[PDB]
Ligand SMILES: O=C(O)[C@H](O)[C@@H](O)[C@@H](O)C(=O)NO
Ligand SMILES: O=C(O)[C@H](O)[C@@H](O)[C@@H](O)C(=O)NO
Ligand SMILES: [Mg+2]
């Protein structure tokens with residue numbers, strides 16, 4: 001009975017970061033400040049622990065007490081499928097409070113617990129495909145910061161820097177509200193043209209555009225991208241409209257990738273395959289409710305001979321990418337010329353995703369998710 | 385480097401069984417006799433081992449030397465996805481010698497090795513869903529043995545015995561060549577009616593018919609089954625014809641389950657979903673080339689909200705069933721009134737799939753695949 005879960009705990013602590021998020025939820029660099037971060041811990045009878053990080057609201061007491069503890073406490077931690085399905089079945093009646101984000105942090109903590117318990121990296125437990133993987137440099141949303149990402153020329157200069165760092169692929173996130181003049185398709189294309197000019201034809205280029213363009217605007221964006229040899233166009237329209245994506249993919253020659261933000265996990269992603277709403281599937285640990293369903297989405301895509309690109313940085317997504325074949329990249333970012341991604345986080349002693357000068361991220365040979373957690377820092381910086 | 389594979393070994397031994405296979409490959413009870421059986425062993429630097437069983441031809445020297453050793457030796461055994469994909473990529477150029485059967489035994493041995501190494505049952509490593517599962521009694525193909533499975537009445541009598549044993553579901557395999565008069569749709573339906581009469585309306589009933597009926601004969605069989613409230617019809621036609629199954633499913637009200645024997649693993653099974661060639665998907669460790677791709681098939685089906693029923697008995701299939709939700713049964717069989725399934729095999733010290741009196745199979749709490757191997761018996765009974 002050493003494998004039985006005895007405790008579920010949340011520690012909220014302050015992290016110092018220059019990353020801010022605007023009113024729409026987009027990241028930007030700004031003043032160094034302290035932000036509240038949460039760590040979820042699952043503990044078993046024998047004292048073994050698994051941990052994962054998320055925003056405090058996602059693991060607030062309402063959610064832990066009403067849903068999470070009731071599913072987990074007293075259960076064999078290795079029954080990840082049963083526990084995941086139990087939590088999933090409680091979402092419908094949760095008054096919209098038990099979200100996929102909550103499922104994700106719980107599932108990740110359970111995987112970390114299994115890996116730490118067995119002394120195994122998560123991707124090795126799943127069944128490894130690769131120990132290193134190419135990363136694309138994922139550029140932060142556009143801004144109005146002088147020398148930052150304010151002009152098309154700003155994107156081109158930053159792209160040169162990224163190529164020097166070793167990235168073999170680069171993804172632009174272009175301008176979005178509340179940027180004063182945004183969005184504008186012509187501006188987005190000028191940024192794309194500036195980057196292509198700067199890096200030449202042998203660097204892979206992708207764009208993740210304003211996410212609420214009309215069909216006609218997304219069509220015009222896509223056409224412009226084809227002339228620049230871009231590899232994909234990502235989420236240029238509201239993904240709640242499967243039909244719009246079917247239409248856009250049918251019209252555009254450039255591959256459309258998605259859905260990133262759509263609900264319904266692997267079940268709804270199957271519908272994207274069936275409807276021909278994308279050329280390349282998308283998944284992500286946070287987007288589909290954990291490592292467990294992310295793996296399902298990867299397998300789903302593979303059975304159709306499709307790639308499925310994994311949204312998001314951090315260990316949880318890196319381990320999905322390392323355990324699977326049909327994904328071209330790990331997404332490393334978001335990046336901005338004002339910030340140094342390789343500096344990491346104050347609550348981690350080292351990077352979860354270090355990248356060599358050839359543009360390969362090497363999965364750390366550390367058990368569980370391999371997050372090198374600075375528990376002392378977290379204790380010294382507690383809120384609640 | 386303790387996890388590096390150092391050896392791949394095959395031991396052929398004699399097992400005493402009353403099971404024979406006719407020239408078409410169907411099992412029947414006959415004289416007790418000795419049959420050659422193979423055990424594949426994968427060993428790592430630290431001396432840890434994983435084992436799996438198969439027919440000797442499937443792991444003969446040609447296949448071990450030309451393919452299996454070249455992929456496995458010197459590799460981290462935990463890289464199951466990489467090793468599986470490497471073997472898969474060698475099938476095309478293998479002059480038809482590297483079969484899904486070979487991939488399956490290799491993948492199974494790798495899973496057993498991981499589980500044994502960590503002291504974990506394979507389904508717990510994957511991520512457990514259930515520790516016990518309902519089994520259906522899977523009845524051997526029909527025969528011409530008096531009191532065996534020679535008449536419709538014989539099926540009904542055997543079905544009564546199975547309900548007493550605890551089975552909540554029963555699947556008939558009906559008469560096939562080389563049975564002298566077979567096949568015959570009206571006889572198949574007489575057997576089905578005899579079973580329904582014997583067990584009443586609350587036992588679930590399935591049929592797996594002669595596998596090469598024409599469209600029109602399978603249609604007639606299906607219509608007949610609908611009047612008897614059967615749960616599914618399985619492989620009544622050549623599965624090489626996806627179109628025939630789409631037609632049959634569209635015409636029949638009774639659920640069609642498949643494909644069992646079709647090649648192409650999870651990739652081809654996706655096409656069965658897309659074409660609507662079945663109502664319930666089918667997979668099996670031996671049919672799709674291992675535990676790894678059987679899991680993929682289960683996930684594929686789950687994303688479409690479908691069940692995927694797992695073909696075959698033994699530990700390897702039981703662990704797939706135990707790790708997943710969208711499968712109603714474990715297939716326990718093949719069964720015949722002349723044989724006692726619960727007697728097991730001479731080369732296993734106990735059953736991999738013991739069933740309680742309520743018809744639940746309990747997954748053994750033993751590491752790896754949990755096969756309780758009698759290594760001493762195997763050594764005393766060696767051939768090569
Ligand atoms: O609009 C945004 O903030 C970005 O699209 C963001 O969600 C980013 O993480 C993304 O979509 N990457 O692929
Ligand atoms: O034809 C046979 O021998 C049976 O159909 C056999 O393949 C059996 O294992 C099966 O199909 N079970 O579902
Ligand atoms: Mg995106």
Ligand SMILES: [Mg+2]
Nearest residue numbers: 249250252253
């Ligand atoms: Mg297109």
Ligand SMILES: [Mg+2]
Nearest residue numbers: 592618619644
């Ligand atoms: Mg069958």
Ligand SMILES: [Mg+2]
Nearest residue numbers: 633634636637
């Ligand atoms: Mg039908």
